[PDB]
Design a protein around this ligand. Structure first.
Ligand SMILES: [Hg+2]
Ligand SMILES: [Hg+2]
Ligand SMILES: [Hg+2]
Ligand SMILES: [Hg+2]
Ligand SMILES: [Hg+2]
Ligand SMILES: [Hg+2]
Ligand SMILES: [K+]
Ligand SMILES: [K+]
Ligand SMILES: [Mg+2]
Ligand SMILES: [Mg+2]
Lengths: 267, 262
């Protein structure tokens, strides 16, 4: 029924509404994680059994981190230890146990541990900022696109990756800078929901810019290894789930580090 | 004469919190140098990631006083560096994969004495490390003398259900001794007489998985030994392998059964 836009229009609002409660964010993350991991793990394994177990592990973290332990390091270790254990049992080949753990390992840090960073950002910095981080990336990719088509080269992106320029990243940086008075006072004049200060603007942009840049390149290197141009096919809009959030993954952690440094405690 | 000098050094490093960090960072240089060197024999490569692995404890404990932040900075830095050095994409994967298992298993896991120290008293901190030294010993005698019902698979050496049980008992027993010899001696709080079983069970069960994981990890790279940094037969990673799993799991247990420190 003229499907691409009947549902490319559906997504955007869904995500945001999930920022309503802390418990809600966990829900989206755990959900984004099932898909994201399903793809990164399925590239290393096409076994009926295997894939699924580790994929369930990857998604379990947010709920364990936020709801059970209210501490991150403990579950991170339980999930990784459980993994290695399981692998020893399933893969009877030793040199192959390595490969599955290596995959599970990159999956854990990059996908699960990184994406889960909205969790601390949410509670420690207000859902407001939480939503700002995720969107700044949606905005970075857009501003870098126009400025990219029109402002030419001094390309940073290698063979295997798509195409990304120093000039192209700068535009997206600016677009983010500008995007935030708008977000800032439209969120602060509107409602007294504390957001980042007018002085922590540059860094946030710089990381949303520089991290998204590295996250996409890492993925292309990650993709190219497994041989595909696309990460996986779980999604409608062209490009799979991991592909959508790749740059975001690096951004969030680094950006939390920045906030933690410049916005103290807001709770 | 390596076996006489070592034992006391380690312990003396439990004198201060800042000291423990020192040993960890140090144990880490060696431990990582070996696990990373098995994936890379490049002059350049190895060294950078090895420095990253060792940086964590100092960042975790002294700078951030929070673990998640440095863990991510070190892993992000790693991926960045790799992209620059390894111009081959399918090869960038391998180095990150290696660096990745190195980060979680060696650095993130060994660093667990850090929380255990501040949140549970250097006393217990020292108990965790030693319980393993003791587990391997008690499992050895009981192992030689009590034979089959083998848990260990092809690739690993040879380990038995009976063998692990003895080491469990040995640990159980080892702790009144540690307990009241540390509590009647000096009022330095240690684990309660009721959190004994779990601690043993994990020191037993985790050390068992950590050594098997390493043999699978060793066998992949083709060596019988992890690396040659050390005097006594067996390299650094080989010494601490089982410990690695134990500490985290054991902290989880303490955190559950010993609450908090003043
Ligand atoms: Hg929603
Ligand atoms: Hg401000
Ligand atoms: Hg690519
Ligand atoms: Hg020392
Ligand atoms: Hg007690
Ligand atoms: Hg082995
Ligand atoms: K990409
Ligand atoms: K081993
Ligand atoms: Mg992206
Ligand atoms: Mg061992």
């Amino acid at each position: 029924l003229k499907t691409r836009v009947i549902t490319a229009s559906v997504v955007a609002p869904f995500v945001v509404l999930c920022f309503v409660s802390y418990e809600s964010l966990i829900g989206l993350v755990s959900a984004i994680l099932i898909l994201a991991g399903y793809e990164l793990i399925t590239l290393e394994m096409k076994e009926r059994d295997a894939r699924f177990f580790y994929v369930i592990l990857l998604a379990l973290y947010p709920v364990l981190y936020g709801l059970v332990f209210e501490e991150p390091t403990q579950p991170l270790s339980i999930l990784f230890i459980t993994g290695v254990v399981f692998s020893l049992i399933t893969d009877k080949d030793p040199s192959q146990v390595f490969k599955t753990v290596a995959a599970f390992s990159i999956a854990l840090i990059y996908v699960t541990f990184f994406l889960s960073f909205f969790l601390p950002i949410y509670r420690d910095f207000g859902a407001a900022n939480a939503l700002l981080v995720l969107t700044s990336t949606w905005v970075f990719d857009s501003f870098a696109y126009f400025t990219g088509l029109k402002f030419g080269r001094t390309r940073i992106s290698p063979r295997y990756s798509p195409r990304k320029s120093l000039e192209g990243v700068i535009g997206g940086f600016l677009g983010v800078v500008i995007y935030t008075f708008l977000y800032r006072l439209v969120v602060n004049d509107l409602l007294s929901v504390n957001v980042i200060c007018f002085r922590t603007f540059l860094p946030f942009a710089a990381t949303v810019a520089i991290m998204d840049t590295f996250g996409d390149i890492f993925e292309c290197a990650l993709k190219r290894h497994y041989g595909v141009k696309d990460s996986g096919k779980t999604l409608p809009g062209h490009g799979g789930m991991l592909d959508r959030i790749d740059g975001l993954l690096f951004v969030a952690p680094v950006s939390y580090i920045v906030f933690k440094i410049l916005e103290g405690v807001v709770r």
